[PDB]
Amino acid sequence: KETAAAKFERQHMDSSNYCNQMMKSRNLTKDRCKPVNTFVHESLADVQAVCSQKNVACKNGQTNCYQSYSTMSITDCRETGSSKYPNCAYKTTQANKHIIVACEGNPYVPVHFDASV
Structure with a gap:
């Protein structure tokens, strides 16, 4: 199956509409309407480098x-009130914030998006 790191790229990387395209194309409206999701609009290498940056809980x-x-730069997709499975409707939203990711493995790479601050 895909690696966790592969899952992180699919669910969170990307180098009130845009979301509808993305929550679909990335297979996050597949078995459920995944309620919230952040896509990071930066380079793969950039986001991987965060694994060597500020260590936090x-x-x-x-x-x-x-x-x-x-x-x-990141996009938060949140699921509107009338949105129901399988017509998952999303509110695109845009920010510029620090991201927090959990890293694991050798090589040490992102495997979960924890928060943005």
Whole structure:
């Protein structure tokens, strides 16, 4: 099956409409309407480099989270009120914020998007 890192790229990388395209193309409206999702509009290498940046606590209490030194452009997709499966409707939203990701493996790469700050 896909690796967790591969899953992170599919669900979160991308180098109130835009979302509808993306939540679909990335297979996040497949079995459910995935309620919220952040896509990061920066380079793969940029986002991978965050694994060597500011070490911070993960929301689940694990210690393998990292926060980006620079702000990063990202899109938050949230699911509107009338949106129901399988016509998942999304509110595109745009920010420039630090991202936080959990990293694992050798090589040490992102495997979960934790938060943006």
